[PDB]
Swiss-Prot record, chain A:
The lineage of its organism: Eukaryota, Metazoa, Chordata, Craniata, Vertebrata. Disulfide bonds: none annotated. It comes from Bos taurus (Bovine). Complex I is composed of 45 different subunits. Interacts with CARD15, but not with CARD4. Interacts with STAT3, but not with STAT1, STAT2 and STAT5A. Interacts with OLFM4. This is NADH dehydrogenase [ubiquinone] 1 alpha subcomplex subunit 13. It is found in: Mitochondrion inner membrane; Nucleus. The chain crosses the membrane at residues 24-45. Belongs to the complex I NDUFA13 subunit family. Accessory subunit of the mitochondrial membrane respiratory chain NADH dehydrogenase (Complex I), that is believed not to be involved in catalysis. Complex I functions in the transfer of electrons from NADH to the respiratory chain. The immediate electron acceptor for the enzyme is believed to be ubiquinone. Involved in the interferon/all-trans-retinoic acid (IFN/RA) induced cell death. This apoptotic activity is inhibited by interaction with viral IRF1. Prevents the transactivation of STAT3 target genes.
From Swiss-Prot, chain B:
One of its GO terms (cellular component) is mitochondrion. The gene is NDUFA3. The keyword Cell membrane does not apply. The keyword Signal does not apply. Keywords: Acetylation, Electron transport, Membrane, Mitochondrion, Mitochondrion inner membrane, Respiratory chain, Transmembrane, Transmembrane helix, Transport. InterPro entries: NDUFA3. The lineage of its organism: Eukaryota, Metazoa, Chordata, Craniata, Vertebrata. Residues 52-80 are annotated as: Disordered. The chain crosses the membrane at residues 14-34. It comes from Bos taurus. This is NADH dehydrogenase [ubiquinone] 1 alpha subcomplex subunit 3.
């Protein structure tokens, strides 16, 4: 008399197949790429030109002496 | 030819991006006035020694005093 089949309690689990967790698509990408890229170029011309100012300063001490 | 940019950018999207960097690179050095500031600096970098010359009568300009306003003005860069 002690056999298995239970009265209730069932799901089931799915046979489904989906995980569309997107994801900033469709022209939202290529937008964070370009602006941060020119931001790095914007970081230039305030350092290389600044080091160029120090570069003439470095060559200044050479020319002032040597007579 | 209007879909020709939309039947290869959905077909081979690698060299299409190369030709756009082949473009926008040849054209722009002839466009913005930030160039020729590249030329004014790259000539005004003193390597060698500026040797003075001999006076005889003239004197058109530039006496012996270095801190006199007697030469050019490249001092815009320090103000820049």
């Amino acid at each position: 008399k002690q056999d298995m089949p239970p009265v209730g309690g069932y799901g089931p689990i799915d046979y489904k197949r989906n995980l569309p967790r997107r994801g900033l698509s469709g022209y939202s990408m290529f937008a964070v790429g370009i602006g941060a890229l020119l931001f790095g170029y914007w970081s230039m011309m305030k350092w290389n030109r600044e080091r160029r100012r120090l570069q003439i300063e470095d060559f200044e001490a050479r020319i002032a002496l040597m007579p | 030819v209007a879909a020709f940019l939309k039947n290869v950018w959905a077909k081979e999207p690698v060299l299409v991006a190369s030709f756009a960097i082949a473009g926008l690179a040849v054209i722009l050095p002839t466009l913005s006035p930030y160039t020729k500031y590249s030329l004014m600096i790259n000539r005004a970098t003193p390597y060698n020694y500026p040797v003075p010359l001999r006076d005889d009568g003239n004197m058109p300009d530039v006496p012996s005093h270095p801190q006199d306003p007697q030469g050019p003005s490249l001092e815009w860069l320090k103000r820049l």
